[PDB]
Subunit: 326 residues, 4 copies
Amino acid sequence: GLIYGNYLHLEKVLNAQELQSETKGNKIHDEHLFIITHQAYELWFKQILWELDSVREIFQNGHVRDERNMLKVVSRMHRVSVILKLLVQQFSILETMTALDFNDFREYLSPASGFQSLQFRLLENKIGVLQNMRVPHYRDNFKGEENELLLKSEQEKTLLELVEAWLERTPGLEPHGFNFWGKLEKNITRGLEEEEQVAEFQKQKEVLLSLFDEKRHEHLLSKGERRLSYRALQGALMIYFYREEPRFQVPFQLLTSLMDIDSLMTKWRYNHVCMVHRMLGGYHYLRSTVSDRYKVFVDLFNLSTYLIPRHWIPKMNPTIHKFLEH
Amino acid sequence: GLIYGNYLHLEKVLNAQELQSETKGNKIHDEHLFIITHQAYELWFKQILWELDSVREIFQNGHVRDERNMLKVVSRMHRVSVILKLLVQQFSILETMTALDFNDFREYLSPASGFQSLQFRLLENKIGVLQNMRVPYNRRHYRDNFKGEENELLLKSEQEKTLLELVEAWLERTPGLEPHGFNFWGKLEKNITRGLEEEFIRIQAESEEKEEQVAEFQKQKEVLLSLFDEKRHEHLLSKGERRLSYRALQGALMIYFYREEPRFQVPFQLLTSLMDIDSLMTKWRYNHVCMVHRMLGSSGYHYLRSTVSDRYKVFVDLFNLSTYLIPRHWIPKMNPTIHKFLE
Amino acid sequence: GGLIYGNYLHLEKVLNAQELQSETKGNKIHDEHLFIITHQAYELWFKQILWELDSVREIFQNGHVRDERNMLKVVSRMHRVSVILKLLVQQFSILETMTALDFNDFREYLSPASGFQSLQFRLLENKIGVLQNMRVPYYRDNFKGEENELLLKSEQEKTLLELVEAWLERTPGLEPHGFNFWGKLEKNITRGLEEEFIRIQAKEESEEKEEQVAEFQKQKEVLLSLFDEKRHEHLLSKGERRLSYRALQGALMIYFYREEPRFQVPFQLLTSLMDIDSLMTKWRYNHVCMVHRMLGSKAGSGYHYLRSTVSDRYKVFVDLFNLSTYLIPRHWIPKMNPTIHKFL
Amino acid sequence: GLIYGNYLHLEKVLNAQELQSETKGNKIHDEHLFIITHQAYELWFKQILWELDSVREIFQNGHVRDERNMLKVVSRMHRVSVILKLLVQQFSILETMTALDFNDFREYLSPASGFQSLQFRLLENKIGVLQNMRVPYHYRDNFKGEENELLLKSEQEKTLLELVEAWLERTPGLEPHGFNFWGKLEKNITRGLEEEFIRIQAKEESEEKEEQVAEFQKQKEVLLSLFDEKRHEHLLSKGERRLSYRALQGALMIYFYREEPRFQVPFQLLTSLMDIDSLMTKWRYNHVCMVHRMLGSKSGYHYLRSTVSDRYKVFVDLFNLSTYLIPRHWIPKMNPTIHKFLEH
Ligand code: HEM
Ligand code: HEM
Ligand code: HEM
Ligand code: HEM
Ligand SMILES: Fc1ccc2c(/C=C/c3nnn[nH]3)c[nH]c2c1
Ligand SMILES: Fc1ccc2c(/C=C/c3nnn[nH]3)c[nH]c2c1
Ligand SMILES: Fc1ccc2c(/C=C/c3nnn[nH]3)c[nH]c2c1
Ligand SMILES: C[C@](N)(Cc1c[nH]c2ccccc12)C(=O)O
Ligand SMILES: C[C@](N)(Cc1c[nH]c2ccccc12)C(=O)O
Ligand SMILES: C[C@](N)(Cc1c[nH]c2ccccc12)C(=O)O
Ligand SMILES: C[C@](N)(Cc1c[nH]c2ccccc12)C(=O)O
């Protein structure tokens, strides 16, 4: 029957290590570490793509509508975070290579770099990094079937788009139902008004009431300083404020997980930068990838700006408590 | 021009994922995670073998004799423990797979397992796990699972000099052991004999806290003086409860007690690193067990639990040197001649 | 002057709690400072774990757990406990930067204190549900006064194991006149085994066939043992099992039907309880691995007693781990008809 | 006889938890986690200060001159980075608190913050963050009395940067009358660049060749700038550099000749100082990433983001030595006399 080595196709995995330094008759020991490290990163990127495409598909084929599938969705998105956490720790292995030892084989690599990682771009695109928000261009490095896959990843529905659609259908937003948005505007307005001192309040008032300016939201959307439809934003805040309601518990975990993935991607970018500095003394472009420009779910972070006292949150009457009960 | 994908042979690495569940028309999502996890472990085992063989070679060809090479030796052995640290953390990824989800594809894997990891055995053997000290699985040797060129490589790895043997040889040549030189072992026996005598006197100044100190002293005396019983050491060597030659043990303790001496600083770091590698291997074995329990309940789970013992710690002697630690003022002083040899 | 960082955090206490016994007897040893801070950091986190754990115990004990609105809070806090324990396992890495030789220079001045006298560690063991007669010999003698009194309360008050057990007994779907999970499961496993024995007895007499019969008979014994309530009571009294028969049924109900909305977060809770058992035993194991490096095969048996705490004798939720033994093909799990899909 | 609780002054450590929310009759559960987390950070800051002051002292009192002490110095500086690694991971515990739950007790804290952490500032100062490298938002104003006095001493007493600089200036091999590292290096880089210009001007006239000439001329300008002591003084005063020209020479001597016995542990020390800078900035970055989650864009979040720059890396010079790496065969060879000087 089946043998470990054959099951895992180790005849491919463990015969993929060719030191360019050796191939030009000057073998450098540490180049082996450089190769395995990248290969391990690429195995895990493939796994992240596998989880991510499976989750994209659960939204796209409508299975997400059946709430029995939310445990699967949150598990796999959580799994992506656990993988990314290891990829952040994995830099510690490559930091055991000194700049001097790297310098002895660096010449033999030119002009290859992570800029040519197909999977890293697929991953960025599939989460929902938009091309016009990227700092300088990126797809020039790719040709043939790879250039074609990269296009599909920009055109096919992103995780951001599929989550946006789902967030728009959040229960409680219906004006002739719970009418969350109307009640919230009323309750914040009635709050506030319950007002030589600081009089900072005017700052708080401007910020909170700006939430209800749909026009400001559309302007900021088109400048790419926000990413979610106004209606998706309402669903997210509905899930935040009413997270203890049974039907919102796992959805709240999902929103938390999406923010975790943004955090860990940017931590990956930051640990990469911190190491490129040590190796080369490039370094400036990477530093500019560590900004909110590249956080696909920045809207979910910025909802913290619009937190209010508990007693302002529109109360749930027995009818709507029962709608949000499994 | 060279291309990232081509440099890394990603045409092999990223086309090595075949789900047996899919191959029999019932694809299970989590089987993909099962495969990548093993492949990642196997890439890192290959890297550990690369570091380990490079270090074995530096001892075997005599380069280690030139002390300028100790930074390289300690860096690579330290690198091995950083990789093992990640491999211990890597179990956390496979723990995101539930036993229920694993159960949906387990059938399609039979009868393969990690028992057939060639690299894991090469790694155990090359560090210096002895075949006769291994726990048997279903009353058989671990090498039955392998045939042909793989069985042959495993044999070479048992017969070729292990890291334990090469470190032992190097430890035997440690400066300061020469009876007609510093004579570390003679001075130490004298100073421990004197130190114990001074301690007995301080105590024979009665109470019940005093009586519990006499019992403790008599225990400490028996243990410390047993160090100088070369006969007991040879007996324990042959029972495999110890691994290093008596002379290698002397070198190790020389490096421990005189670690601040310039020529002993990096050697001390190396001994610390060898213990780190033993600790992290056993942590790997323990995290593997803790997870097999969660996935299966059951014997596999019992044999693995028995691999988490001092039977499998190749450098157990370096841990057990802590038993024979003594107060600072007992350690034989270094006169200006021998300070200068180590500086 | 309103509120000040130092005052808010009572840093006048926290940062004036470091007294090196080596210094107090006129022979200051540098690394003793690290020994003290490391233990103090462990004890701050033990206090936090007790805070989360007592809050969760209380939500079960006062009946608030019955309102499923509260399960997000319960799973968050139990998850938080395992995140803290993960850091406590990593925290050993700091104390491993102390050599055995450096430890040996101040060890004398500590006698006869040890972690055996950690009140909070015992409170934590007791409150999760470590049972007194399953503790390895060479524990309460070390403690006196109001500490001895708190330890007693922790043994007498309802443990997390007891409170989870009670809640697991009320799991929906166990009612014989309802979904009748246990009856349907016995029927489906009994039928499934019968179908499998027939598929096997068809095969032409061989050696591969006989090794399948031996494998089948093993599987049959294990699965059908689930329905032996008497075996379960015997194993309960030997302390090889901890959950009531009915609590075991609820746990397996939640395992098999975890995707059902009402079971999703409860499944996460069961997962978290197993995580806490895993991380406690990892804490015990990393402690052992380090005591070996510091003391060798010397007393404090020491290194040997600790090694015996790293067993399933100390896993409070062993029953949750061992449910993996009784996993069955998917198509054997009793189907949910539209009526019971709607209840969950 | 000594008791665990008493040895560790747990009567202080575990009675330092006062929830302001409870003190104003509205107890919020998660405030307890907020307090323990900060107290654990502050215990570890105290330990880092203990290691750091002990190492400062070994330089300041001349013990560092005796190379017997390098193992101690590197162990303790390595210990600092292991502690900082845990402090970076420790953010994961506070990330188990949601912004909503934080918001329920945030009001009761005003206007206290980490800006009032005495130990964080002592730590920044003692490593060698200077006044003129700080982003402006007068950090000292928050402190009064004996705390203001400690902060002053930390600015005035010799920093780790100053003490390392002094030691690096005495590095063997820099003496013009001896190995004369700097002279030989200028000669070998000048010769090496000449050989390289020739190898390039030989190549078949092309566009790939012209892009190599532009690359060479860039590399030549950068390498030769190393020997411009005037450019170094200019960059020192603009705070783009921190180390004396002579200290920089010692560092590069240790980099290129690290395998020489007397340089092995010194190389580890330089590596460790870079590790400490990396982990401090990772601490600053994980703090920022979490303040974002808790507060949004409310400056605050913007000032912290500006602390995550090379302006706060005290040993940025040690990172930037990688800019001046050269092929192995250009490094001045060591004759038998100087091989013997760098032998323990
Ligand atoms: C010594 C180690 C490393 C150095 C010095 C290094 C250096 C760099 C530099 C300078 C860049 C900017 C592009 C360029 O100039 O070519 C870059 C980009 C990149 N590197 Fe690396 N790298 C290293 C390791 C890694 C590893 C292990 C990975 C894992 C796959 C990786 C993935 C990437 C990716 C994905 C990019 C594109 C980044 C983006 O566009 O956001 N690098 N690297
Ligand atoms: C769901 C995950 C896993 C399960 C259920 C599992 C199960 C087992 C079992 C039962 C054994 C004992 C031999 C046998 O009866 O099969 C074993 C041994 C082993 N497994 Fe795993 N394993 C898992 C994951 C891994 C992974 C990811 C590795 C990575 C290399 C691995 C490496 C090994 C090795 C090397 C052995 C032989 C160990 C020894 O003899 O000391 N396993 N495994
Ligand atoms: C150098 C470090 C350490 C050494 C050598 C050490 C040694 C020991 C020993 C020998 C015991 C068994 C009882 C005895 O003979 O006195 C013990 C128990 C214990 N230690 Fe430690 N220990 C260390 C660090 C720590 C730390 C940092 C903690 C943190 C709280 C800790 C907590 C405990 C606890 C709670 C016990 C009771 C264990 C049980 O019954 O399951 N130890 N330690
Ligand atoms: C929910 C958790 C936290 C929030 C929201 C938070 C927020 C902030 C903010 C806004 C500042 C800037 C000063 C101000 O405008 O008041 C700050 C600075 C600071 N925080 Fe935090 N913080 C948190 C947790 C922590 C923790 C756990 C520590 C642990 C010691 C800490 C240490 C500091 C330090 C030292 C500063 C001064 C930073 C500098 O000058 O570079 N913070 N924090
Ligand atoms: F490549 C492989 C193949 C099978 C297993 C395995 C199987 C364990 C097992 N349990 N029951 N049957 N096999 C554990 N790791 C593996 C790696
Ligand atoms: F607060 C304390 C005091 C002593 C110890 C200790 C002593 C262990 C020991 N080994 N040999 N003698 N004492 C281990 N953890 C501790 C914590
Ligand atoms: F002792 C304290 C008190 C408050 C804070 C804090 C508050 C930050 C903040 N932002 N908005 N309101 N409070 C961050 N670290 C702290 C330590
Ligand atoms: C029927 C539904 N599953 C409802 C839904 C939409 N968005 C949500 C967010 C949280 C909870 C629920 C929902 C659906 O429309 O998909
Ligand atoms: C010349 C020598 N390198 C000496 C040697 C042997 N073992 C040691 C331990 C520590 C320091 C040195 C040694 C050699 O014989 O290898
Ligand atoms: C009404 C109920 N909350 C029902 C209950 C008990 N255990 C469970 C496990 C999963 C889902 C639900 C339950 C109660 O009695 O607590
Ligand atoms: C005698 C000496 N320890 C020499 C010294 C200074 N900096 C160094 C760096 C590496 C090796 C040595 C040194 C001293 O002058 O302190």
